[PDB]
Write an enzyme that holds these catalytic residues in place. Structure first.
Site, PDB file in Angstrom:
ATOM      1  N   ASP A  45     -14.750  -1.547   2.985  1.00 47.36           N
ATOM      2  CA  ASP A  45     -13.611  -1.660   2.143  1.00 47.36           C
ATOM      3  C   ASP A  45     -12.260  -1.168   3.189  1.00 47.36           C
ATOM      4  O   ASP A  45     -12.563  -0.528   4.215  1.00 47.36           O
ATOM      5  CB  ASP A  45     -13.723  -0.356   1.441  1.00 47.36           C
ATOM      6  CG  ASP A  45     -11.675  -0.248   0.621  1.00 47.36           C
ATOM      7  OD1 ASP A  45     -11.065   0.690   0.978  1.00 47.36           O
ATOM      8  OD2 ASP A  45     -12.176  -0.813  -1.192  1.00 47.36           O
ATOM      9  N   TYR A  50      -4.010  -1.245   6.561  1.00 47.74           N
ATOM     10  CA  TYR A  50      -4.787  -0.170   7.312  1.00 47.74           C
ATOM     11  C   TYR A  50      -4.429  -0.854   9.176  1.00 47.74           C
ATOM     12  O   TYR A  50      -5.015  -0.424   9.725  1.00 47.74           O
ATOM     13  CB  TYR A  50      -6.362  -0.262   6.655  1.00 47.74           C
ATOM     14  CG  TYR A  50      -6.655   0.489   5.521  1.00 47.74           C
ATOM     15  CD1 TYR A  50      -5.935   1.636   5.023  1.00 47.74           C
ATOM     16  CD2 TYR A  50      -7.586   0.299   4.737  1.00 47.74           C
ATOM     17  CE1 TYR A  50      -6.050   1.733   3.398  1.00 47.74           C
ATOM     18  CE2 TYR A  50      -8.149   0.860   3.316  1.00 47.74           C
ATOM     19  CZ  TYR A  50      -7.442   1.964   3.274  1.00 47.74           C
ATOM     20  OH  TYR A  50      -7.548   2.511   1.654  1.00 47.74           O
ATOM     21  N   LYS A  79      -6.382  -5.449  -0.443  1.00 51.17           N
ATOM     22  CA  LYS A  79      -5.852  -5.316  -1.137  1.00 51.17           C
ATOM     23  C   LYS A  79      -3.952  -5.262  -0.262  1.00 51.17           C
ATOM     24  O   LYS A  79      -3.858  -5.046   0.525  1.00 51.17           O
ATOM     25  CB  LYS A  79      -5.406  -2.901  -1.097  1.00 51.17           C
ATOM     26  CG  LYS A  79      -7.596  -2.286  -1.142  1.00 51.17           C
ATOM     27  CD  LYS A  79      -7.433  -1.522  -1.633  1.00 51.17           C
ATOM     28  CE  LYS A  79      -8.349  -0.402  -1.285  1.00 51.17           C
ATOM     29  NZ  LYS A  79      -8.625  -0.348   0.083  1.00 51.17           N
ATOM     30  N   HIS A 112      -3.207  -2.028  -4.481  1.00 53.59           N
ATOM     31  CA  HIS A 112      -3.603  -1.071  -3.510  1.00 53.59           C
ATOM     32  C   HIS A 112      -2.860   0.353  -4.517  1.00 53.59           C
ATOM     33  O   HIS A 112      -3.471   1.338  -4.341  1.00 53.59           O
ATOM     34  CB  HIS A 112      -2.768  -0.644  -2.588  1.00 53.59           C
ATOM     35  CG  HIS A 112      -3.435   0.105  -2.117  1.00 53.59           C
ATOM     36  ND1 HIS A 112      -3.186  -0.511  -0.316  1.00 53.59           N
ATOM     37  CD2 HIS A 112      -3.919   1.303  -1.282  1.00 53.59           C
ATOM     38  CE1 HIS A 112      -5.011   0.228   0.752  1.00 53.59           C
ATOM     39  NE2 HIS A 112      -4.562   1.390  -0.435  1.00 53.59           N
TER      40      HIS A 112
END
Ligand SMILES: NC(=O)c1ccc[n+]([C@@H]2O[C@H](COP(=O)([O-])OP(=O)(O)OC[C@H]3O[C@@H](n4cnc5c(N)ncnc54)[C@H](OP(=O)(O)O)[C@@H]3O)[C@@H](O)[C@H]2O)c1
Ligand SMILES: Cc1ccc(S(=O)(=O)NC(=O)NN2C[C@H]3CCC[C@H]3C2)cc1
Length: 315
Positions: A45, A50, A79, A112
């Protein structure tokens, strides 16, 4: 050890969480993603937010090149960030994720968060008094663009994250809906077990994917330092004693036995390898009821600004 999604694709029930705070050098994500793959993780994931898709993608290419895995053995999630909800921005956002990671496709692309933010290059756009700038977007249109990413082969599966029930129904009742969300990735742990949302999801063939399943990273920028530490919970520790495992392993196993697909972030080699031992033991129905009793509607993530957003999911 997979679940069949409502579009016929298969998701591994244990996933590797890749987010680390910016003080962790970006090379670490490369290293530990390799380690997770070596240990046995297959579902991975990540997200545009990120700032790691290049590193995670390189770990995956590295483990394919050395013959440990094939592409089709890996389930990779990215996402769409909340600055890219306008439908025209969805495809280019995904293509950029794919370019960064050097993949031809993602296994799963998620919205997201339902909380739309102003389009632009800032992840967190703010106005001249430092206030976050919200955007208003019909998420049904976002979703249509998601469906088009699927048909385009760029995402094998599409789903959502941080949606409440009302938000899910808005997608499910959309006129001309082509693909249901395969999942809803949400905060979920023994202090916030989401049983209501989970039963709703089950009634609609939507998989609930748990994050912060180990109590979150307790990041000082979004998590109250006075929140209880999940893995010190005395019911969880006494179950760990009983089964001769660890409290993390109790928390992970809990999700698996209730039909939840569970993520686990570790940047530590021995904890990474420990987490895959979730498949080695089982909790009793009475253990599971004991854990079900722990819920305290506690969400580790807080931001007062996000609470005013019209789509704040915990309204
Ligand atoms: N969709 C969303 O909005 C959203 C939000 C949050 C997270 N996520 C995703 O979910 C992933 C996991 O959630 P999270 O980052 O909040 O963390 P988490 O999985 O709840 O883990 C939190 C902490 O537990 C530690 N831990 C891991 N295994 C352990 C074990 N066996 N024993 C003791 N401690 C252990 C880790 O520290 P060490 O690294 O030191 O082991 C980690 O920092 C994220 O990385 C991200 O992929 C998604
Ligand atoms: C910059 C940053 C902020 C938080 C995190 S994180 O909280 O560690 N992980 C995560 O995926 N995103 N957040 C939870 C979602 C609900 C509200 C909007 C989304 C943000 C990672 C990175």
């Amino acid at each position: 050890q997979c679940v069949k999604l409502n579009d016929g694709h298969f998701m591994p029930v244990l996933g590797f969480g890749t987010y680390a705070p910016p003080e962790v050098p970006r090379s670490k994500a490369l290293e530990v993603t390799k380690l997770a793959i070596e240990a046995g993780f297959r579902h991975i994931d990540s997200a545009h937010l990120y700032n790691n898709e290049e590193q995670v993608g390189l770990a995956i290419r590295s483990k394919i090149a050395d013959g440990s895995v094939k592409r089709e053995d890996i389930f990779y999630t990215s996402k769409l960030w909340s600055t890219f909800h306008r439908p025209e921005l969805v495809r280019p956002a995904l293509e950029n994720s794919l370019k960064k990671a050097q993949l031809d496709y993602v296994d799963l692309y998620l919205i997201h968060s339902p909380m739309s933010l102003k389009p632009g290059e800032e992840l967190s756009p703010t106005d001249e008094n430092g206030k976050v700038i919200f955007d208003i977007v019909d998420l049904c249109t976002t979703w249509e663009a998601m469906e088009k990413c699927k048909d385009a082969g760029l995402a094998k599966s599409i789903g959502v994250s941080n949606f409440n029930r009302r938000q899910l129904e808005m997608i499910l009742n959309k006129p001309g809906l082509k693909y249901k969300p395969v999942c809803n990735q949400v905060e979920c742990h023994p202090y916030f077990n989401r049983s209501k949302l989970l039963d709703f999801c089950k009634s609609k063939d939507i998989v609930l994917v748990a994050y912060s399943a180990l109590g979150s990273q307790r990041d000082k920028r979004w998590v109250d330092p006075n929140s209880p530490v999940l893995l010190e919970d005395p019911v969880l520790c006494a179950l760990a004693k009983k089964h001769k495992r660890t409290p993390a392993l109790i928390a992970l196993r809990y999700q698996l036995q209730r039909g939840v697909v569970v993520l686990a972030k570790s940047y530590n080699e021995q904890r990474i390898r420990q987490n895959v031992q979730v498949f080695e033991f089982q909790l009793t129905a009475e253990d599971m009821k004991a854990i079900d009793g722990l819920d305290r509607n506690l969400h580790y993530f807080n931001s007062d600004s996000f609470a005013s957003h019209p789509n704040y999911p915990y309204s």
